[PDB]
Every structure is written in C-alpha cells, then in structure tokens.
C-alpha cells in the first residue's frame, strides 16, 4: 500500500505535530476568515482539458473561451493528473484528503477501494461542515468506485445519483449520450441553502467516454495523422466541451446572485483518452495536465500557482479565501508552495517537507495512528 519512511516513529510524528502547530498559529495571525463561513463546491469536470495544449490538434473554434476568461480572473492554472483517460476517483480522493497519490505504492489502483477503508477516522475538508450540509453528486451509480461507502463514512446527508441511493436528480436532461452538466449545475443551485454553510462534492458525467454530438456543427476538429474515428471522437468531445463552457459560465453567474460567500474548486480529472501519444509531439508532459480554477462569488484574489497537484486544492482553497488553517493544512500549505509537483525532487528543502508529509500520510493510512494522540493536529 505504501512504504514506511525510514524515520517513522512516535517521536517523529510528535516533532511534526508541534512544528506545524506553531506554523499554523503564525499563518493564522495573517489569515482573516474561517472556512466554515464559506460554502465550498468541489467540482470534478469529467475529462475536461483544453485541447489547445495538444500540439498536433486543430479545432475550428475556441471551445473553452468562458472558462479561460474565468481562469484569468482568479486563482487558476494547470493541474497535474496521475492517469490518462481514466482514474476519476483517485483525483477525487486526493482533493478531499489532500494525500498525494505519488507517495503511495504503484500497486494501488483505486484509492477508494484499497486505502480509504483502511483509514482510521479519515480527515477531509468536509469535516468542517455539519453532516446535514454535506452533499455529494454523481450522475451514475452511487456504488461506482465505492463512492457510496466513502460518503456514508464521511457523514454526508445526501448523495444524488442515477441509482444506488435514495437521492435523485431533478429535471434530468442529456447533452450527448449522458447527463448534461446543465442538469448537474441546476441541481447544485436547487440545494444551495443561504442560511447554511454547505460543502458539495460533485463528479460530472457529460464528457465521459463515449462522446457523441452532432452540434454545434460548425465546430470541427482534426489531428495530424489521426484516423477518421479519432478525428470524430475529438470533434464530438470538442463540441461537448463547448456546452460545458457556456453552462459553467451561467452556473457561476447564478452563484453571484446568492447572498452567501461561495467558492468553487473546478478541475478536470484527466485528459480524455481519445488522443494518440503522437498528438503531443514535443510536449508529452501535456498528456497529464488539465485545467483548474478556484473561484469565489465575491471578490477574487489571483494567487500564483501555475502548476499544482490534485492534493493541493484544499491548501490552495484556504490561501485563496484567506481562511485560518489547522496544523495539518499548515503542512499542506508548505507543500503547496515549496514541495509540490512544480519543484525539483532533488532539492533538499523539497525532500524535508515531503518527508514530513510521508510520515503523516503513512500514520493515517496503514501506520500506527500516532496522530490520534495529537488531538489538535486536524482542528483549526
């Protein structure tokens, strides 16, 4: 599951718990807000990634104009994904727990099935919200990738799904072969209670393979040396992105009219699996780089984070909203800024901060659970 760090021990965990208890206090002398005062929406946009970064691809129209405009106005950039054309629930796991996949063993396939059940009292961004205000959504089977079990153990009062739960979507409509993002967005609006501070964990389905769309007909796409099938999949996918682009803009515009501080963490989990490796040419790294933005309905700062991991979203959320952190999220803020996927793995500073994270990550998964004795490590 995961390798034990050489220096894993009860004292090494104590050293870490104290260090970041103090760092949390220092950071908190400058952070103003409390996360529990914002309504937060974690929005996994299935397979969303700007094809402009695919070198050998040409699209007749810009299919992500609105989303790119949103990225310019607030904290936004590229997210490094751990897989290609799949692995949805693994990125999802990393956003909630902030434990990076790249520190686990490569033999792990699905974290929701092989790690989460082995976690004693998993800590998540959702724990700062009341159970009655924790909401999950996914237009498919609630049991896919063990999600129903995950959100039950996290105390979620609702899990809207096409099947496998008491909760259902309303006014279901299809764009393409699957449930539209419009349907998902409006179901989020249907449940936003301004009197309560809520947390939403959303996993869309519109742009999940297979892709079929004949409109907008003017949008056509092609790639160098693609087959007819590859070109047609790319065209259908591009057409479907154009709908998600417009509906995402509308969705955010409707959040501006709600009297409640709302922040959205939007990101594609991975590129669609419709490109051959040749499509990337001189930049094979673009095979695993999706788009993300952290956007609030009030005024938005724009923090400089052009490349981060799915596990960095919560720490970036706290920074964007100037919210006070816990000792745990103080460590994750040190990771976000000084030891994430944008830094060299050979830097001594990166190694040190990553050693702290690995010990913590080992402790709460298949380790001894020393952190149960440091009772303030996960509290603000």
- Residues ending a continuous segment of the chain before a break (C–N > 2.5 Å): none
Distance of alpha carbon 133 from alpha carbon 129, whole angstroms: 6
Distance of alpha carbon 330 from alpha carbon 333, whole angstroms: 5
Please identify, using beta-carbon distances, which residue of 248 and 326 lies nearer to Mn ion: 248
**Shortest approach of Mn ion to residue 70 CB, angstroms?**
21
51, 96, 211, 319, 344 from 69: Cα distances, Å: 16, 26, 25, 21, 30
Distance of alpha carbon 214 from alpha carbon 240, whole angstroms: 9
Please identify, using beta-carbon distances, which residue of 47 and 235 lies nearer to Mn ion: 47
Please identify, using beta-carbon distances, which residue of 88 and 263 lies nearer to Mn ion: 88
Q: Within 10 Å of residue 73's Cβ, how many Cβ atoms?
A: 11
- Which residues from 292-311 bind Mn ion, rule CB under 5 A? none
Give the interface size with Mn ion as a residue count (CB under 5 A). 3
Out of 82, 269, 291, 319, point to the residue binding Mn ion (CB under 5 A).
269
**Shortest approach of Mn ion to residue 272 CB, angstroms?**
9
- Rg, C-alpha atoms of the chain: 20
**Shortest approach of Mn ion to residue 117 CB, angstroms?**
21
Distance of alpha carbon 171 from alpha carbon 177, whole angstroms: 16
Please identify, using beta-carbon distances, which residue of 269 and 319 lies nearer to Mn ion: 269
Distance of alpha carbon 88 from alpha carbon 143, whole angstroms: 14
**Judged by CB under 5 A, does residue 46 bind Mn ion?**
yes
Q: How would DSSP label each residue in 17-30?
A: HHHHHHHHHHHHTT
Looking at 60-68, 125-133, 268-276, 368-376, which segment touches Mn ion (CB under 5 A)? 268-276
Do residues 306 and 342 touch, judged by C-beta distance below 8 A?
yes
Q: Are strands 134-141 and 199-203 parallel, antiparallel or unpaired?
A: parallel
Please identify, using beta-carbon distances, which residue of 31 and 138 lies nearer to Mn ion: 138
**Shortest approach of Mn ion to residue 27 CB, angstroms?**
33
- The site map against Mn ion for 87-106 (x = CB under 5 A) is -x------------------
Question: Residue 79 pairs with which residues in a beta bridge?
Answer: 290, 308
Strands (E) located in 47-109: 57-59, 76-80
DSSP annotation of 207: T
Please identify, using beta-carbon distances, which residue of 46 and 291 lies nearer to Mn ion: 46
Q: How would DSSP label each residue in 349-373?
A: HHHHHHHHHHHHHHHTTTS--GGGG
**Shortest approach of Mn ion to residue 180 CB, angstroms?**
16
Please identify, using beta-carbon distances, which residue of 46 and 245 lies nearer to Mn ion: 46
**Shortest approach of Mn ion to residue 201 CB, angstroms?**
14
Looking at 43-51, 67-75, 182-190, 278-286, which segment touches Mn ion (CB under 5 A)? 43-51
Smallest CA-to-CA distance from 244 within 185, 295, 299 is with 185
**Shortest approach of Mn ion to residue 171 CB, angstroms?**
24
Strands (E) located in the chain: 39-45, 57-59, 76-80, 134-141, 158-163, 199-203, 221-223, 262-268, 289-296, 307-309
**Shortest approach of Mn ion to residue 266 CB, angstroms?**
14
Please identify, using beta-carbon distances, which residue of 122 and 272 lies nearer to Mn ion: 272
Looking at 42-50, 69-77, 184-192, 323-331, which segment touches Mn ion (CB under 5 A)? 42-50
What token pair was written down for 72?
């310019």
Looking at 80-88, 199-207, 273-281, 307-315, which segment touches Mn ion (CB under 5 A)? 80-88
Please identify, using beta-carbon distances, which residue of 181 and 269 lies nearer to Mn ion: 269
Q: Compute φ and ψ for 88, nearest 5 degrees.
A: -40, -60
**Shortest approach of Mn ion to residue 116 CB, angstroms?**
18
Please identify, using beta-carbon distances, which residue of 88 and 206 lies nearer to Mn ion: 88
**Shortest approach of Mn ion to residue 226 CB, angstroms?**
22
Looking at 129-137, 187-195, 265-273, 353-361, which segment touches Mn ion (CB under 5 A)? 265-273
Looking at 31-39, 176-184, 267-275, 330-338, which segment touches Mn ion (CB under 5 A)? 267-275
Residue nearest to Mn ion (CB): 88
List of residues contacting Mn ion (CB under 5 A) = 46, 88, 269
């Amino acid at each position: 599951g995961m390798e034990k760090p050489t220096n894993y021990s009860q004292e090494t965990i104590a050293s870490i718990a104290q260090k970041y208890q103090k760092l949390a206090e220092d950071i908190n002398k400058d952070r103003k807000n409390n996360i529990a005062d914002q309504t937060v929406i974690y929005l996994l946009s299935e397979s969303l990634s700007d094809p402009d970064r695919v070198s050998n691809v040409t699209v007749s129209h810009d299919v992500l104009p609105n989303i790119k405009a949103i990225k310019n106005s607030t904290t936004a950039g590229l997210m490094q994904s751990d897989s290609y054309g799949g692995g949805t629930a693994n990125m999802e796991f990393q956003t909630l727990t902030s434990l990076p996949f790249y520190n686990f063993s490569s033999s792990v396939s699905v974290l929701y099935s092989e790690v989460f059940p082995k976690m004693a009292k998993p800590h998540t961004i959702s724990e700062f919200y009341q159970g009655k205000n924790r909401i999950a959504m996914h237009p498919a089977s609630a049991n896919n990738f063990n999600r129903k079990t995950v959100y039950s153990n996290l105390g979620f009062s609702k899990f809207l799904a096409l099947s496998g739960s008491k909760d259902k979507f309303k006014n279901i409509e299809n764009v393409g072969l699957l449930t539209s993002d419009k349907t998902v967005y409006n179901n989020i609006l249907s449940l936003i209670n301004p009197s309560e501070s809520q947390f939403f964990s959303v996993i869309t389905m519109q742009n999940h393979i297979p892709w079929s769309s004949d409109y907008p007909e003017e949008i056509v796409a092609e790639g160098k040396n693609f087959t007819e099938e590859e070109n047609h999949n790319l065209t259908s996918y591009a057409r479907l992105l154009s709908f998600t682009d417009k509906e995402t803009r509308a969705f955010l515009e409707k959040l501006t009219q709600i009297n409640k501080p709302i922040t959205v963490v939007f990101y594609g989990d991975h590129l669609p699996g419709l490109y051959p490796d040749s499509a990337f040419n001189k930049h094979i790294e673009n095979k695993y780089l999706t788009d993300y933005f952290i956007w609030s309905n009030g005024t938005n700062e724009k923090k400089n984070h052009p490349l981060i991991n799915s596990s960095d979203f919560t720490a970036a959320l706290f920074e964007h909203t100037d919210s006070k952190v816990s000792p745990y999220y103080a460590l994750l803020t040190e990771v976000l800024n000084k030891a994430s996927v944008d830094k060299s793995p050979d830097s001594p500073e990166v190694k040190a901060i990553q050693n702290d994270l690995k010990n913590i990550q080992y402790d709460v998964t298949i380790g001894k659970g020393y952190l149960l004795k440091h009772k303030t490590f996960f509290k603000i």
